[PDB]
Design a protein around this ligand. Sequence first.
Ligand SMILES: C[S@@](=O)CC[C@H](N)C(=O)O
Ligand SMILES: C[S@@](=O)CC[C@H](N)C(=O)O
Ligand SMILES: [Mg+2]
Ligand SMILES: [Mg+2]
Ligand SMILES: [Mg+2]
Ligand SMILES: [Mg+2]
Ligand SMILES: [Mg+2]
Ligand SMILES: [Mg+2]
Ligand SMILES: [Mg+2]
Ligand SMILES: [Mg+2]
Ligand SMILES: [Mg+2]
Lengths: 167, 167
Amino acid sequence: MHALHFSASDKAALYREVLPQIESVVADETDWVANLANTAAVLKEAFGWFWVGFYLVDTRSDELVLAPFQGPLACTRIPFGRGVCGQAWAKGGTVVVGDVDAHPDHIACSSLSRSEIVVPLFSDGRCIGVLDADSEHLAQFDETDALYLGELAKILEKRFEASRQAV
Amino acid sequence: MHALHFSASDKAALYREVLPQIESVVADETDWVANLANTAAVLKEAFGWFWVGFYLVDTRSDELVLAPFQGPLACTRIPFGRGVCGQAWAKGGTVVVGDVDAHPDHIACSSLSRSEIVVPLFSDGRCIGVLDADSEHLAQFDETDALYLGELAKILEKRFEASRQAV
Ligand SMILES: C[S@@](=O)CC[C@H](N)C(=O)O
Ligand SMILES: C[S@@](=O)CC[C@H](N)C(=O)O
Ligand SMILES: [Mg+2]
Ligand SMILES: [Mg+2]
Ligand SMILES: [Mg+2]
Ligand SMILES: [Mg+2]
Ligand SMILES: [Mg+2]
Ligand SMILES: [Mg+2]
Ligand SMILES: [Mg+2]
Ligand SMILES: [Mg+2]
Ligand SMILES: [Mg+2]
């Protein structure tokens, strides 16, 4: 059975400890939802963010649809271009928000969130979904999170491709 | 935005408070995984159990496959008939475990859980998955949990069927 150690006190060092563990945990499963669910579990345990999880693109509706996550209840559907999530999708790149109250068109599924980061995932150069993380603290996410969650996105993208191949 | 109230300080009273809120939240989405994810979130926030979430039957492999959940990372696959989860599937009914150490063939995905409840979900007669909840406390789950998580199971079953008819 897999088990996770994370000892490191500095943010960047904790990512360097956590990412290889995630890689190992998801290497062992083809099911995409299972892998997203365990990913978000590892992130929540390691970093303690208020909310962390995924939305996946629905090509039929041009909406992000809620997938696995840790934290309180969330909105199920985010239109293309709306919110930090829909902005990330539209831009094709990561969005870091130091103060959600000061950010344009943030969607507040929780009144409690104050900062956020959204990292898009791609297959064949099309966005398939986003990783979203939220904090109750202002400015919880910075370039360290963008770098390492971007690397995690790459690891997950490969698992998405494995999930398609496994059908 | 959907938004939850938990006042109740007694377990049974809290189920009575929370089940209608879950029913409302899941009524307004057809995607099965989104609904499971938000249900796990509501249960985790309301009851604070160590782990709460779902496994879904994979008919290709005769295994339960990890779906949305809250709590630490978990096993991705449980064979038919193995563990509390596989036993609930094989029995076609709820299994309540007061102490995972006296239970035959408990699967310990975390070393920290001490008590558990599994409630199966059905469609067209057959098991489609299970709700599993785990606690670090002994005997956290009793007849109140069996009753009300069984009613939750039926609420969810109706959403599974609605997911198949949605367009
Ligand atoms: C999980 S919840 O915070 C998702 C919506 C997001 N804040 C956004 O602005 O898109
Ligand atoms: C989430 S984890 O505890 C799942 C396995 C379960 N205890 C079982 O015995 O089937
Ligand atoms: Mg996994
Ligand atoms: Mg999860
Ligand atoms: Mg909640
Ligand atoms: Mg549904
Ligand atoms: Mg829902
Ligand atoms: Mg969840
Ligand atoms: Mg069978
Ligand atoms: Mg018990
Ligand atoms: Mg209980």
